[PDB]
Design a protein around this nucleic acid. Sequence first.
DNA 1: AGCCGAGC
DNA 2: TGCAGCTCGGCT
DNA 3: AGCCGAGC
DNA 4: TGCAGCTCGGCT
Lengths: 663, 666
Amino acid sequence: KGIPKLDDANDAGGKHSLECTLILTEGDSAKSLAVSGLGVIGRDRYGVFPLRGKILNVREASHKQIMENAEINNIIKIVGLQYKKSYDDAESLKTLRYGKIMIMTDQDQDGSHIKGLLINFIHHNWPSLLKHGFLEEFITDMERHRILFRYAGPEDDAAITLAFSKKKIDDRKEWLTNFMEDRRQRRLHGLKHLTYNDFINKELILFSNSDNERSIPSLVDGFKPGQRKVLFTCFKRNDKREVKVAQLAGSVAEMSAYHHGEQALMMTIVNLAQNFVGSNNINLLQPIGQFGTRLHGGKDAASPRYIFTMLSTLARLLFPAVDDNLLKFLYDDNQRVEPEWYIPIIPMVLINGAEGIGTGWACKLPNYDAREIVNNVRRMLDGLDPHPMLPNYKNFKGTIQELGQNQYAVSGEIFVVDRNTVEITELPVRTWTQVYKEQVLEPMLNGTDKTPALISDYKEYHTDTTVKFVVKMTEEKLAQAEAAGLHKVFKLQTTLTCNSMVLFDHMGCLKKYETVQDILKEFFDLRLSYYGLRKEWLVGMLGAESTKLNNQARFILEKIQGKITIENRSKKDLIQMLVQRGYESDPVKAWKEAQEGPDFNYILNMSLWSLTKEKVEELIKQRDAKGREVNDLKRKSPSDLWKEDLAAFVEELDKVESQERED
Amino acid sequence: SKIKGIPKLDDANDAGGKHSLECTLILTEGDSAKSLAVSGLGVIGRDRYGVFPLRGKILNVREASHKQIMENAEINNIIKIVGLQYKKSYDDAESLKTLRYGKIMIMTDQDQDGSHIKGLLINFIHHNWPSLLKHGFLEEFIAKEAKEYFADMERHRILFRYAGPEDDAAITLAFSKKKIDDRKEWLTNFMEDRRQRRLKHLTYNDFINKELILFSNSDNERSIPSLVDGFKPGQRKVLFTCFKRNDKREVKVAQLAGSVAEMSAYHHGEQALMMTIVNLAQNFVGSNNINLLQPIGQFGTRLHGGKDAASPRYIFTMLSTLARLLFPAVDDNLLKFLYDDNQRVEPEWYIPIIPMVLINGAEGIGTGWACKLPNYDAREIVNNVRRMLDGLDPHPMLPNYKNFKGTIQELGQNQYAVSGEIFVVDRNTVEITELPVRTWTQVYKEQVLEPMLNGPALISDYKEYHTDTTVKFVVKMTEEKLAQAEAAGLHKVFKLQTTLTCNSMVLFDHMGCLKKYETVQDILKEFFDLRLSYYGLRKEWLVGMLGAESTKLNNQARFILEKIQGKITIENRSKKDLIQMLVQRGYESDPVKAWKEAQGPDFNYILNMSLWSLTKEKVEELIKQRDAKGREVNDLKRKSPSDLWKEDLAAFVEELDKVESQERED
DNA sequence: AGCCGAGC
DNA sequence: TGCAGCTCGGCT
DNA sequence: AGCCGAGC
DNA sequence: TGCAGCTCGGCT
Ligand SMILES: O=C1c2c(O)ccc(O)c2C(=O)c2c(NCCNCCO)ccc(NCCNCCO)c21
Ligand SMILES: O=C1c2c(O)ccc(O)c2C(=O)c2c(NCCNCCO)ccc(NCCNCCO)c21
Ligand SMILES: [Mg+2]
Ligand SMILES: [Mg+2]
Ligand SMILES: [Mg+2]
Ligand SMILES: [Mg+2]
Ligand SMILES: [Mg+2]
Ligand SMILES: [Mg+2]
């Protein structure tokens, strides 16, 4: 009574309570379809209530969080449940307004996750209810869609616990390892009641796995699938002017078959464009408009509906168009979409870091310096070993120092000005300006219930991209602060631990990398061999292009010398004639064909202009130029090709970063 | 005093204190403006300046209900932040001592809707505290640019001045429900004067008469449809975009909106455009007789009046096959396309083959005027057009709603009774099978049947057997109560009869003048003369163009024939010599290009032909094409504009039959 | 205790 | 993912 | 006491 | 136009 969006069952709460089913739906739309297929007749024994968004995992949630959750509370009230009340006997079930809950989600992995979270909720508070068979599901003949969950022993308790307990992270790792190894095996070969154990190990695990596939980036290009689709869509559009972020998101959805809510995409586009300190070392997309600042960690970005973006000039230098011919492009229902990965010229995964949380594993990598990485790549091309690399954030004025393995001290900047004054001109990476102010300087100024005041005043002189705090203290307090350690006292040192460098390798296998050098080496070997493929590809293609022009130059000359005439000949006479004179069928088309009647259209589609003087000359020059182009390319090694790309990238990186310091 | 529960307020440091009157509350249009203001004020500004954002148009408090006024978030917030009190005169300097701020600075977009918000705020103060206006309570303010604007603030700062009773009358003219007539005259003079011209302190009177009036006029320009195509500009931009796009598969509505925004220079929030798209696509009883866009997905139903439409990111649309039959592509060449800053956008109007303004029943609300037209039958209209083409008189027309099973009877000029369907089944039972047009099923249940069942109850039970597109109530009652109901009249008792009155058919005519039309027959005639005239233009245009195409093909065939015969050669000839030779032999510079311009010699249309052109099959194919084009121009010259119109009408009716048949099956 | 971000 | 209210005129 | 819809 | 909360793992 008095709950929004609840369509309570007529007989709910009465004598026929335990004959009533509450349908919990995934969102209002599923609630509407349930309402349509239910009433008028089904209105007596069936209630409907929509849930919007993932629900609280209650199993180890705090008391406050549980007591305040809107969704859990609404279910408790609607059903008549009570905490701590066992439902062991058949007389205690009389207090319930509903006898069954039917879960109705999308028939997809996120749907399974909500099912799971609802199951987890009941199993945690009222396992007794699971033994009577309290939960059903509606899969999308209305009784043939109804499937009953069935508790059948402690192995069902163990499966729900494995999936939803914070204490079972290690077990989930093993769990998913078995799943990933098994599905890898089957890839080389081939391919009414439901226990909770079968749901967890045969359905939920599909979500848990997809969670990893969408949240943990690839080593090769540093992208997750959604990010990859964004770049793919952008490369394809080739926008020469800015696009609304919201419009770009719709375009990605269309062109790359992204099957998810678009606000996620818009947020991802924003993340790819951000360029403040502690975000992207190299943003592949331009933040045209307010995309967020270091004042609020980007949380001050404007709506995707009022900000614009387009490719950075660095994007195609980093992911050259020509390499597209070597990628494996995926398919979504007979539409070709994004590749399994791009193959950038430097390991992008290190340049911009890597943040991802999945199931069993999570990924964290800090930023690394683009020029250092270029230099180490050049070293490895020379046969030398790469230098060790420290994390490095563009425009960060502080220090990052190694403490141990995969652990670092990140320090901002504080200098004593006089005996009453310190100045803070840099905050440690990922410490935001507004947050430092509210959580450090204010308490330092005002004291708290648990800490005394330490400073007498502070003044702000920040810009949008820099930090300047001028802080006043008594001489006494400044002296004490110095003895204690200025950086320490002012919370300007944080540590950075990187013991979860978890990525998908090029084969699609999840792996833990112990050092960044390992990531660099695996990337290097792969990228070097792709320059080999690129060269082979270019030799063939340029070659076919050369053969093409040869046949075209040959026909024009034979034509303007009267050695051949096409005037008023039938198509078949013409084709037989050209064959008999040894003209090759379209070499370029032939060559693309090999990469998986005679065609002389590349000749006869030429304009009449071709026969004129300037056009004969111009055609001969092009033929000769392509011939030299074939030989210039044969002279270049994979390493040469890579070195050209690196040089072009650094040149533009310098121009672009120089212009940022001006702009 | 401090202010506790107003989350988005940034109170001036000195507001509510000794220096209250020296503080300014900046009221902004939206949160974005607030942020820019907060940046502009820096840290210095925080002391004498408060910022509070308003989101959306605010309540017109003049003549508003007491309830509305008491429950409104924005005006109650403004009242709390400033410390105002209803019914208190702020004449002397004593009375001013209970205020937390001395002045309000309004900061809106420098566009028409901004002016409207300023005016509503001004209206709010003028209505409750006229005394405050005399003191100069109200002022206004005209990226990274933000911190710069505020250091030069004084130039951007305008003060409103109260100068006499003419200031009271201007505000009252704009915002009083009692001054609709004066607003009509106000805008009429404005529109007239504007038509002719084509041939530090700011008094309120000048704000109303020189700034707000521009909003009122824009309000009509966007809300009141054109007679010619039955569109308002937002709708027109959508259609224009769809034609340009020419989608062969469904596009998400939200994506379409973004596309319209881009291609047609739509300068407003996209949610309004997505709603317009949904509106153009709807096809439940009482919406469109001919939906130009297809409702692929849940676009709403008669159950809730379309308000049950799914979100625009989960629904799809595309052109109806009928759209280009109604708005033929060839006629695009006769339209005046508009420019928005170098970009070519939608036309001033489209010119459909029947008066679309009557088919889907245009409706809108502006300032001074509003528009309502009911739906009319497409075939009846086609038939009246045919009648007028033969010099006959058009039959009078009754409103007609596609798939409406009830009755529309004419009481008199522009006056109609619209009735649903109710019939006695037995002596305990009536059945309701149609609701009057625009009575929605759920609403009828809630406001009619529910009361009858409950609170002096009249019926005993009722059951529902609706479908998505049909209505069926079966109603149970005692013989005694049914006999009474049936005596008083079943349609009357069950409220299945509504009146439809149409005394405000206001539309922009073809010249962009607002006009009131008294009958649909007037609308139909004025449309008819324009459209017939445009079949004239289309014929002229087509004869010119097809002629140029004929010439073009003549020269091309000629070159080809001459080439395959030896009479001419281009092999190894200089470009310069080749041009000169073609000239000497009297080949014509691109006839099509030349014709288009007419509204050195260019022989590219000859020389860009492929070598394939010289081959046997292509030579015959070219001769065929040349002849056919010649026949096409001759065939068109013989025809009258009426003939062309009749061809389009017949094509339209044939597809309308197919489409509507397939709907009743599907 | 709360951030990180790609989903609902 | 869905939630939140107002203008303006004619009409009921 | 509220619908209709193109705006904020 | 802006408003609302949760998952999952590592780590502060
Ligand atoms: O449910 C969504 C939601 C969704 O179901 C599908 C797509 C979405 O984008 C949302 C959603 O955004 C959402 C809320 N958004 C608040 C802003 N936080 C970051 C959103 O990306 C804020 C709240 C919210 N749902 C509230 C229910 N909370 C679940 C806890 O039991 C949602
Ligand atoms: O302010 C908007 C708004 C806007 O400023 C710009 C664009 C918008 O689409 C809105 C807006 O939709 C809005 C509200 N929408 C509720 C859905 N019903 C109306 C259909 O858009 C519901 C409330 C709302 N504003 C809050 C209430 N302000 C009215 C003053 O009494 C707005
Ligand atoms: Mg789903
Ligand atoms: Mg990043
Ligand atoms: Mg505006
Ligand atoms: Mg309509
Ligand atoms: Mg009113
Ligand atoms: Mg946690």
